[PDB]
């Protein structure tokens, strides 16, 4: 009978970076999705494998809310089958993904006049990430034909690069908050239901 804590997810004060995205397990509650779609705050509300209108009528199990902050033109990369820095090295969605990607502009919270430097993306990884795999490991990596055995060789590249968030930036570079809801369609007893 109790409500699901979407307020603790969407209306949180701080979001984690896309390399270290926050995963919250939502279970044992009634989820009212009608306050999400009818809100005009969300610029992107794209659901794969389920219609958003039907979200109230279905009972899910193991609902996951994945929250992070990415820039404006990378929101298209939060989709199945997309390529880019975020899809390959930061946050990968499976090909058989069922769920919803919700993203909204957060320029008035996540930008500072001198530049906000709290959100960082994994610029490079040795291989592409597996679906729903998190890489919080920050490791020094080499450059080519010379090893990273000190300063002696070609200087060693760092994987994590911070976003330059300023309020004067044009759209597409502005901070966008992304919450990815992931569901499972009726296998074990369902714990998250609509009204």
């Amino acid at each position, epitope marked *: 009978t109790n409500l699901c804590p979407f307020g603790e997810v969407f209306n949180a004060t701080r979001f984690a970076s896309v390399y270290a995205w926050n995963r919250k397990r939502i279970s044992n509650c009634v989820a009212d999705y009608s306050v999400l779609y009818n809100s005009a705050s969300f610029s992107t509300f794209k659901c794969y494998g389920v219609s958003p209108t039907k979200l109230n009528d279905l009972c899910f199990t193991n609902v996951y809310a994945d929250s992070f902050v990415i820039r404006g033109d990378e929101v298209r990369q939060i989709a199945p089958g997309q390529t880019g820095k975020i899809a390959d090295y930061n946050y990968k969605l499976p090909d058989d993904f069922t769920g919803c990607v919700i993203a909204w502009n957060s320029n008035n919270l996540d930008s500072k006049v001198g530049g906000n*430097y709290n959100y960082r993306y994994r610029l490079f990884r040795k291989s592409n990430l597996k679906p729903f795999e998190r890489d919080i*490991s920050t490791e020094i990596y080499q450059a080519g034909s010379t090893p990273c055995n000190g300063v002696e060789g070609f200087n060693c590249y760092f994987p994590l690069q*911070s976003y330059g968030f300023q309020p004067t930036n044009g759209v597409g570079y502005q901070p966008y908050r992304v919450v990815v809801l992931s569901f499972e369609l009726l296998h074990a007893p369902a714990t998250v239901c609509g009204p």
Partner: nanobody, 119 residues
Framework: EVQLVESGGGVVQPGRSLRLSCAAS????????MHWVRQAPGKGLEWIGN???????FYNPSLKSLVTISRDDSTNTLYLQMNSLRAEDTAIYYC?????????????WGKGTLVTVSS
């Protein structure tokens, strides 16, 4: 020209604090992000921390609460406070500089400082 110099190394007791300084000369300290890296004898390089112009400090998940990165922009210097020194922190420390408007290339490096912990 561009130059990074460090100070604060020596032989100290374990658990006593240290303050390693990285002075930058020849370039404006802004618009670049500063890194602290250490390498142990017989081991490869290990990244410690990052600090930006905002004051956002990012640490390695492997080591927590041992270090504190403190930037200062009046005199273009970078400070590291090391607390609760363990025996395994014997290492050569390096100060690194990345440009914020490019890939994460660390460009010029500090010469390094030696920290030896003993009992």
């Amino acid at each position: 020209e561009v130059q990074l110099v460090e100070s604060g190394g020596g032989v100290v007791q374990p658990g006593r604090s240290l303050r390693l300084s990285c002075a930058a000369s020849g370039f404006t300290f802004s618009s670049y992000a500063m890194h602290w890296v250490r390498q142990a004898p017989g081991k490869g390089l290990e990244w410690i921390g990052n600090i930006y112009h905002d004051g956002s400090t990012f640490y390695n998940p492997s080591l927590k609460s041992l270090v504190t990165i403190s930037r200062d922009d009046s005199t273009n210097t970078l400070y590291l406070q090391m607390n609760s020194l363990r025996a395994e922190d014997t290492a050569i420390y390096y100060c690194a500089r990345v440009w914020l408007y490019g890939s994460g290339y660390m460009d010029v490096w500090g010469k390094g400082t030696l920290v030896t912990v003993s009992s």
